[PDB]
């Protein structure tokens, strides 16, 4: 690997603007009381894409990484022919994050969570002796599991039992990757809660979800790939959202590109989408409100079971936090759409038929967004549209593959006892 310099950056509290050094794994500005994201301010103001050998890290100028890891792949962006003609769009670009070797997409875990995994794991110290803790609906978990296993990084995953089928792998994992689950019936936020209980134990630290600049700047490489491929900033960004981290990241990528100057100065409009009937962020945005409406916990867990796109069901997303999704929608004049399971299933067939690879339900929600937006006359036919296919190639990939599944060492009730969880996760890594 090449003579690589850790990326220079400082941190900025979005709420105030306070600028300060990252002491390592800062996930908030401790001088700020309001909930606020921090954002990386990169010293390399102008993006210089490294050669392809760098894989995902070809974008490291704007990633908070101290090292590179082997075997990464970057988002692939290409101009659509099938889908574009079907929609009458002249400038439709697909940014594909998954397994589709024909176009050069080699994210073998089949989602853009690989950008999160490779970026976050590269931000961490390699002397780090604490166990990294990650909660996921499935896709983030599969990404960190692979990367952390390949690189002997201690990782505790918190995935809901109902989602553990997502934890498939070509080969048995390293024993440095351990998994615990919230019981059958719980959803992703229940898994967050289990992971926050486990974090009460010494020797464990949190990935932090959307609070981790590595996760956002990792995800933002879809937009970097798109802009550096197309040669300008798109007019529309379509992405199904569960936490909205990738939409926040897209916005942040847009701002950095504008500060860069060489690609124009327009602001990409965010077109984000949720799977009915789990549509809390959509409902709040339709209300013009920074506050999430009231969502009775049992109903939300049922709605989470109903939707096809299981990664889309987050009860506690970075919606209202300063710098979060509400702020990004307001800043980009963005729009929020809903897709039914039915629309999503049609969208998946459509994409397979016209672009030649299978995609996740979640990506199908975004595709459905696009179809409905176009049909409503919202998209100029010459508009530059980035469709972010956040996951694809699972069928394609599992084809004639013996798969190995990560199963939980412990399954806990929805409100576990702190003592039990702590003593068990402690035991897990001793
Ligand atoms: C395939 C897929 N679609 C949609 C999403 C939701 O994206 P976000 O994290 O920006 O909410 C994810 C998140 O991991 C995903 O993996």
TrEMBL record:
Cofactor(s) recorded in Swiss-Prot or TrEMBL: pyridoxal 5'-phosphate
Entries under InterPro entries matching the protein: Cysteate_synthase, TrpB-like_PALP, TrpB-like_PALP_sf
Domain Tryptophan synthase beta chain-like PALP as annotated: residue spans: 108-391
GO molecular function terms attached to this record: transferase activity, transferring alkyl or aryl (other than methyl) groups
GO biological process: coenzyme M biosynthetic process
Any Pfam family: PALP
Keywords: Coenzyme M biosynthesis, Pyridoxal phosphate
Kinase is among the record's keywords: no
Gene3D superfamilies cross-referenced by the UniProt entry: 3.40.50.1100
Name assigned to this protein: Cysteate synthase
Organism: Alistipes finegoldii (strain DSM 17242 / JCM 16770 / CCUG 46020 / CIP 107999 / KCTC 15236 / AHN 2437)
